[model samples]
Target: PFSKKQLKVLTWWRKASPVSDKDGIICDGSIRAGKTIVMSFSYVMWAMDTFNEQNFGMAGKTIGALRRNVITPLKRMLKSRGYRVKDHRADNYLTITFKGKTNYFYLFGGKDESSQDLIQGITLAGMFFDEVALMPESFVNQATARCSVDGAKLWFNCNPAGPYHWFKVEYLDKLDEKNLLHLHFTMDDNLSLSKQVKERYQRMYKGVFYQRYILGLWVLAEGIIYDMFDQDEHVVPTVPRPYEKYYVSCDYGTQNPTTFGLWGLYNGVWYKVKEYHYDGRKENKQKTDQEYYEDLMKFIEDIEKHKFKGVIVDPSAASFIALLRQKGIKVIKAKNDVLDGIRNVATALNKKMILYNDCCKETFREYSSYVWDEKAAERGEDKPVKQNDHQLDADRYFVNTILFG
Candidate 1:
C-alpha cells in the first residue's frame, strides 16, 4: 500500500504544481522514511512526461553514494515498470527511455569546492540532489544554475541537519517565494516500514541523533556534547553481572593525555567497567611508550589476558600499537570518525546502554566537561573541543567500534 505521504511525492507535480506555479520540491525527513526512491522515481517520470531528448542532472555527496542510494533502487523499479535503462558506467550518466521518450541523466558528485567543476558546462532541463544537505552550497548552486530550460525544475531530499545549514537558509526558508513544494516525512509515511523496524531504528539513536534522524527535527548541535546524558541515571556504584564479553578502548597521547577504558558486556548493554586516564603535565613528568605499556598490563591484571577480545587503540598510536602486538596483545585500531564516533557515543550514553562506575571519577569529569565547539558548529562543522576529551575519546572509540555492530 502506498501511504498518502509517499503518494503525494509520487503525484505532486502534475496535480498541484504547474497551476500553482511551483518550481520544484524540498523533502526533508527521518531516515528510511520513504523519501529518496520515490523522489527519484517521480523525477524521472516527470522529466519523461514534460521533456524529451534533454540533458538532466542527478547528484549526491559522491557519485558512488548516488548510485548506492538512488540509482540501484531506481534502476530496479524502472525495469519492473518495463522502462529501458542503459548505464554508461564510465561516463557517469544513464540513458533512460520510456514509452517513446528518452533523456540523458547525468550523475554528478557535489563533494567539495572542486565539485562545482563537474557541472559547470552542462545545461539541464531538471536536477535532483539526493541527500542534498550533505552537498556544499557552491556545488548545489553550480548544478541549479545549469537549469536554463524554459520549464526546468529542482528536486531535493535529505534527512535534517543543524537548523542554520545553508540549504535551510536558502531554499527551504524561501519555499513559497521560490515556488517550491515542501514535504516533511516520518517512518509512518513509509508504508514498507513496519512498527518492529521503526522501533529498532528508534532505539538506535538518542539525544541530537534521535532528534535529527529519528524524530526528523532540524535541531541545533550546541553546548554539551551529550546533552541527554544525566550522571545520576547512568553511573553505578559497582558493575554487577558476569562478563559476557571483555574489551578495551584506548586513546594514546603523550602530551595531551592518554586514556584506556576496560569494558564488559553484561546483561546486554556494555559497561565502562574500568578506566585509566593520565596527564603528564598534571603529574610534572612525562611517560614513555614502555611505561604506558606497563600501566596497561597492570590495568588489566585482574582479568585473564587471553579472555580479552582485543585492545582497540587510536589509529595514530604507532609505537604503542606495535608494542602491544610484540607482546602478543591483540590490537584493533579504533576507527577515528570524529563526528560519527561522537554521535554513537552520545546515543550510547543517553540510552544508558553503556554505563559507568562511580570509580571512574576521571571519566565522569571528562564527560561533564566535554562540549561541542560552538564556533565550528556555526560553520556547519560539528566538532568537540580538544580539551577534556581523553576519556571521552576512549569511550567514543569503545562505543563506535564495539557497540555499533
Candidate 2:
C-alpha cells in the first residue's frame, strides 16, 4: 500500500489543490522515500492531463543521473499506464502520447556553473527537477525562468542536505512566498522497502548523516568530517602479519604531503598496516614521479618482496599514474568524489571493517585536523578543508573504490 504522504503527491493537483494556483510541489525526505517514482509519474500525469503539445523539461544534477533515476522508471511506468513513450535519447528527450495528445520532455543536466546555459533559451510548458538540491541555484533559476507558459508547473524532489542549502532557503523555507507545496517523507513513506532494508540504511549513516539522510532533516554538518571515528574502536595497537592479500592506497603530491598506505585484508577487515608520508615543502625539494614510484616499492617491500594486488592512485597524479603504467603495475585510478567517498568511509569505520594501526601516525594526525570547510558550508556546499587531508584522501580513495575493484 502506498503511504498517505506519497498518495498526497499523486492527488494534490486533482482534489487537494484543485482550484489553488500553486507553482508545484517540493518533495524532500529520507533516502528511498518513494519520492522519485511518485513525483515522476505524477509530473507526466499532470502535464499530459493539464497541458497540450508543449515542450517540458526533466532535469537532474546530470543527464546520466536523470536517465538512471527518473527517465528509466518514467518510461516503464508510462508503458504500464497505457501511455506511449518514444525515447529520443539522441536528443536527450522523450516524446510521450496519451489519448492522442503528445508533448516533448527534454532532459537537462544542471550539475555545474555553466550548466545554467543548457536550460536557457528553451521555452518549457513545465519543469520537473530531480534531486534539485544538488543543482546550483543559477541552473534552477534559468530553468524556472524558461517555463513561461500560461499554466506551467514545477516539481522538485531530493534528500535533505545542509540547513543553509540554497534550495532549502530559497524554495522550501519560502514555500508560501513561492506558492509551492512542501512534503516531507521518511522510509515508512516507501512501501516497497523491507524492514531489513531500513535497518541496513539506518546503520549505514552516523552523526550528521543520520539526521540528513536517515531522518530527512536539514541539519548543519558541524565539526569533524569523520565524527564517528573513535580512537578506542578505530585505532588498533597492532595488526596481524603475513596477511592473505595486500593493496596500497596513495595520494601523490609535489609540494604538499604525499601519502602511501599499505592495506592488508585479514578476517574480513581491511587493516591499514603501514604508511609512508613525504612532504617536499619540509625538505625544500620536490620528488620526481620515479622517486615516488620507488618509495611505493620500498614501502611495499617491507612485507611482500615488493608484491601486492595493485596501487590505488589518485588520477590527479597524471605523471605518477603514467609511470606506474609504464612499470606494468596494475594502476587503479581511485574515484575522486570527496563527499560520497567521505560518507562511505565514515560508514566503513563505524562498522569496524576499516581500522588503522598505531603505525599509521600520519593517518591519525590528519584525522584530528580534517574538519568540514566552513566557507563551503556557508555557500551550501559540503566539502572538507583542503589542509591536513593527504592520508584521508588515500583512505577515501581505497575504501570507496574497493567495492568496485
- On TM-score, the leading prediction is 2
The Cα local distance difference test for each model comes to 0.86, 0.86
**Model 2, span 55-107: residue lDDT tens:** 99998988888899989988998899999999987678888999989898988
lDDT of 1 at 348: 79
Off by over 4 Å in 2: 15-20, 112-118, 241-245, 302-307
For the record, the alpha-carbon RMSD of candidate 2 to the native fold, in angstroms, is 2.4
lDDT string for model 1 (1-405, tens) is 778988888887785544336789999989998789999999999898789999999999888889999999999999998889999998889999999999999999877434466577889999999988888888888888999999998999998878778888788887788888898988989988888988988877777788899888988888888776777788887745678778988989898788888899888888888889888899878889999999998888888665689899987899999999999989998978788788888777766778887788898887778888888788766678999888888888888888785
lDDT of 2 at 179: 92
Worst 10 residues of 2 by lDDT: 111-120
- Model 1: worst 10 consecutive residues (lDDT sum): 13-22
Model 1, residue 68: C-alpha shift (Å):
3.8
Q: What is the TM-score of each candidate against the true structure?
A: 0.84, 0.92
